Amino acid sequence: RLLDELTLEGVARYMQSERCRRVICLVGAGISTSAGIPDFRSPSTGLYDNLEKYHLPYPEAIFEISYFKKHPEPFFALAKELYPGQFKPTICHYFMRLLKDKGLLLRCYTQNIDTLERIAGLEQEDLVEAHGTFYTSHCVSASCRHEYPLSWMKEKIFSEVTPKCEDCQSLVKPDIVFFGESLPARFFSCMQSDFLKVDLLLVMGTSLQVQPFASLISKAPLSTPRLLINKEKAGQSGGMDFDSKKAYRDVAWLGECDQGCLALAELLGWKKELEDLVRREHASIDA
């Protein structure tokens, strides 16, 4: 075992050693809840328990491509509803920023579509936006694919006018991977190389229930330590083994992502760095 204690402090000591050179982050909606964007499956606060106004066969249809092509109005209504007043990345986003600035971040695979990793300062080469982004949008006709900027999408969404392509009159969809859509080729290109060389998996804010993203946790070498920072355990059957008498490399820290990243940063000696980074960047944003 590469960790000497299955605790946050043992992970921090490992990250300070010279074996730990390449860290992969796998992040989900949980790392953005403290920024105002709700997640999907948390009780009462999650989106899946706020979708009766839209009458749906299943709650996930509002994010499924065939239902969208037949009934796009619920999705764009939810879009106008949830569009935040501000886009401020969280302590966890800036913790990943610090991993980048210190040459430790091999890649961040994200399920989020809010572009907060980008705003935190993670560049395209650092990111695998496995499920796309809300930032750009395209006509759904594969022979047209006319692109439209977020400003046009916002005018059409807030005017409550279903977006249509000025060439086909076809539907215009934000560049999100809906259920039943193929993941980008970059995902499968990065996956083949990244998980042969990874020294640490950092999983944060995800229930690990959407495929093939979740299978990423099992692509690492069997000696690679894996730290979950999440309000609840996830990824248990590869497969996260936290509790068993055979456990040897998986550590779970149950709590807020922001609190766990503060704690890990302090254990690393990066506490003041992270605090100043968050202040300076939230200031440049609030301007």
Partner: peptide
């Protein structure tokens, strides 16, 4: 045929 799709 296509690349693997998003699945629950």
């Amino acid at each position: 045929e296509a690349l693997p799709k998003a699945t629950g």
